């Protein structure tokens, strides 16, 4: 009924305020930022995903632009308010729109140190192995044969 009623409801944390917060969270971008902001890729926009805990989860492909490992780093979250701010967060600094560094056209989302090891283990070629020298109908048959 009044603002004080909603304030008390959020203070008591009813089971409905979570389903209400999910509505506003669905399509409202937020800005993440690490302490030393050298270039402009130190501030990007993401779509929040409500998770249980007290730590932020960061996609392991945007760590190169932030220059952020996981040994204690912290980042700040900013919430755009107006319509123009949200449209700029979506159309100018969304994480999926900044994949090429402005210093050189080369990409900045290249995986490393965990993804390249697995792909290097898949695309390896051994000499003697089980199932060597046969003919398959396609890649799905190879997946079935491996699993």
């Amino acid at each position: 009924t009044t603002i004080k009623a909603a304030k008390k409801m959020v203070e008591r944390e009813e089971a409905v305020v979570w389903d209400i917060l999910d509505e506003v969270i669905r399509e409202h971008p937020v800005l993440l930022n690490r302490a030393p902001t050298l270039h402009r890729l130190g501030i990007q926009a993401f779509e929040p995903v409500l998770i249980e805990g007290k730590a932020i989860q960061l996609h392991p492909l945007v760590c190169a632009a932030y220059n952020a490992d996981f040994d204690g780093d912290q980042m700040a979250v900013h919430v755009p308010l107006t319509l123009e701010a949200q449209l700029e967060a979506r159309a100018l600094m969304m994480s999926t729109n900044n994949i090429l560094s402005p210093a050189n056209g080369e990409p900045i989302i290249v995986p490393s140190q965990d993804v390249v090891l697995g792909l290097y283990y898949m695309t390896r070629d051994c000499v003697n192995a089980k199932g060597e020298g046969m003919v398959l109908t396609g890649p799905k048959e190879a997946e079935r044969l491996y699993r």
């Binding site: 007290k54 730590a55 204690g72 912290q74």
Partner: protein, 50 residues
Amino acid sequence: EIKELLKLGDLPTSGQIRLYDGRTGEQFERPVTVGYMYMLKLNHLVDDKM
């Protein structure tokens, strides 16, 4: 000396054993190194930082 101490007990002298996945029961190749490390808890808690 570490190898002799591993051989006193009934333990593999190589240091690596074969593990199985817990979610599928499948066995990892390239037997992994399993042992006991002394870990510490530093006074940087996420409760004092969020």
